[PDB]
Paper text:
Mevalonate kinase is central to the isoprenoid biosynthesis pathway. Mevalonate kinases belong to the GHMP kinase superfamily, which includes enzymes such as galactokinase, homoserine kinase, MK and phosphomevalonate kinase. The His tag was not resolved in the structure. Like all GHMP superfamily enzymes, each monomer is composed of two domains: an N-terminal domain and a C-terminal domain separated by a cleft.
In this work, we have identified, purified and characterized, both biochemically and structurally, two previously uncharacterized mevalonate kinases originating from the extremotolerant tardigrade R. varieornatus (Hashimoto et al., 2016; MKvar) and the psychrophilic archaeon M. burtonii. The structures of the archaeal MKs MKmaz and MKbur are highly similar and their sequence alignment shows 61.1% identity and an r.m.s.d. of 0.77 Å; however, their thermostability assay and DSF results show a striking 20°C difference. Measuring residual activity after incubation at temperatures ranging from 25 to 80°C for 5 min revealed that the T 50 values were 40°C for MKbur and 62°C for both MKvar and MKmaz. MKbur, as expected from its psychrophilic origin, appears to conserve activity at low temperature and has relatively low thermostability. In MKvar, Thr119 and Ile215 align with Thr104 and Ile196, respectively, in human MK. MKbur has a conserved Ile residue; however, Thr119, which can be found at the N-terminus of the α4 helix in MKvar, is not present in the N-terminal region of α1 in MKbur.
Author numbering: 1 to 306
The structure:
């Protein structure tokens, strides 16, 4: 019985602007997906969704990983179970965490000696196949953990304060939001162009402020980012409500994390304000997950000797 896990993640800065050549800063958080494997003669994949075989409708990311592995090492089958603390449809790197956890669990089952970089790359390839296109960001951060400046792929000082995630419970149509931004940029290139550049710049100045743990300043830049995301059309009233509530209850800052148009926001907060921010996000109608940043990336949690 092998159990491996991988964390979810938030963007401190830079969602929507990476595809335009701009830097970003992401942070792995301690809501994790666990994948447990044990040898069998048959493939079984059990989740909250149910038990299937290789099934690209119900379990696409796992099915892709298992395919990739049989192509480099034969296996009679595997009893594979998935547990996750990352809310479904939440937009916190769900698919990347399960992909990366599964790869590590299969690397372990079959002793293939994959390094982290290899795991991250195979992760990217898997998301690329399922999603049509994908950026290497999610699988890299979920593989490595900690605070990562993207795409330099540089580790930064872990966020030591409180992190709250507020879910609007509105599923974000990502491809649509990405496409609206590209269309808006095409219609108004000399307006939107600088807005996206401005988002990039938050990570240039933000890198240092994260390293000095100046979370007041980090929070202020996060608020600016939220406004810039609002400007390119990826926010909504539900996001805004949760975001302002977090700010009114003592957060350093708050903004969308990820695709926008619903999904989750994030707030960072002094530890003395965590309960008060959580409560305010709930009272504004969001579902709160209290997390902490984690320097722990993909990990073997269990490797039982029979
Ligand atoms: Cl899956
Ligand atoms: Mg992902």
């Amino acid at each position: 019985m092998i159990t491996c896990s991988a964390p979810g993640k938030v963007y401190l800065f830079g969602e929507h602007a990476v595809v335009y050549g701009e830097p970003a800063i992401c942070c792995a958080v301690d809501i994790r997906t666990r994948v447990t494997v044990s040898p069998a003669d048959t493939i079984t994949i059990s989740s909250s969704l149910g038990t299937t075989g290789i099934d690209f409708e119900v379990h696409p990311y796992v099915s892709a990983v298992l395919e990739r592995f049989q192509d480099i090492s034969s296996f009679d089958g595997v009893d594979l179970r998935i547990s996750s603390d990352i809310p479904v449809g939440s937009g916190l790197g769900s698919s990347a965490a399960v992909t990366v956890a599964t790869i590590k669990a299969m690397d372990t089952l079959l002793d293939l000696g994959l390094e982290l970089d290899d795991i991250a790359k195979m992760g990217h390839e898997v998301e690329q196949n399922i999603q049509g296109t994908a950026s290497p960001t999610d699988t890299y951060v979920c593989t490595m953990g900690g605070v990562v400046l993207i795409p330099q792929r540089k580790k930064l000082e872990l966020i030591d304060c409180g992190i709250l995630i507020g879910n609007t419970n509105i599923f974000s149509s990502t491809k649509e939001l990405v496409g609206n931004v590209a269309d808006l940029n095409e219609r108004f290139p000399d307006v939107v162009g600088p807005v996206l550049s401005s988002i990039g710049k938050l990570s240039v100045i933000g890198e240092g402020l994260v390293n000095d743990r100046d979370y007041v300043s980090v929070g202020e830049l996060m608020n600016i980012d939220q406004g810039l995301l609002d400007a390119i059309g990826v926010s909504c009233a539900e996001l805004s409500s949760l975001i302002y509530a977090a700010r009114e209850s003592g957060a350093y800052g708050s903004k969308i994390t990820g695709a926008g148009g619903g999904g989750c926001m994030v707030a960072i907060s002094p530890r003395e304000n965590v309960d008060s921010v959580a409560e305010a996000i709930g009272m504004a109608g969001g579902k709160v997950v209290v997390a902490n940043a984690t320097d722990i990336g993909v990990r073997v949690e269990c490797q039982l000797v029979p």
